[PDB]
Amino acid sequence: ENVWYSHPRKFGKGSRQCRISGSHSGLIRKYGLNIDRQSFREKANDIGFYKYR
Template sequence: MGHQQLYWSHPRKFGQGSRSCRVCSNRHGLIRKYGLNMCRQCFRQYAKDIGFIKVRGPRRRHSPAGRRTCGPRL
């Protein structure tokens, strides 16, 4: 059995080795939610084209240093 017969011969049905990005074939940082199957870098590049928009929540105001925001003020 030569190298060509043994290289990548183990079946990849489960786990990280069985999945890759549909755009660049990268196996790291894969987003599988909603069937995207894209790495995070490609997702950032194509998010607008796919139809994703950024939604910013309400901005929280940080209390000044040394002030307690919970409980009665003494």
């Protein structure tokens, strides 16, 4: 409704986000995952990652 209600958020840390909740810190963007490093340890083997060595 109001005119000014945004910023150029097409880059940096504020615009980027995870899939689960939306944390702006500790973000894995490798291979287009977008799941933060706390939840990645929980969901490693379901995706297919394993601790071989």
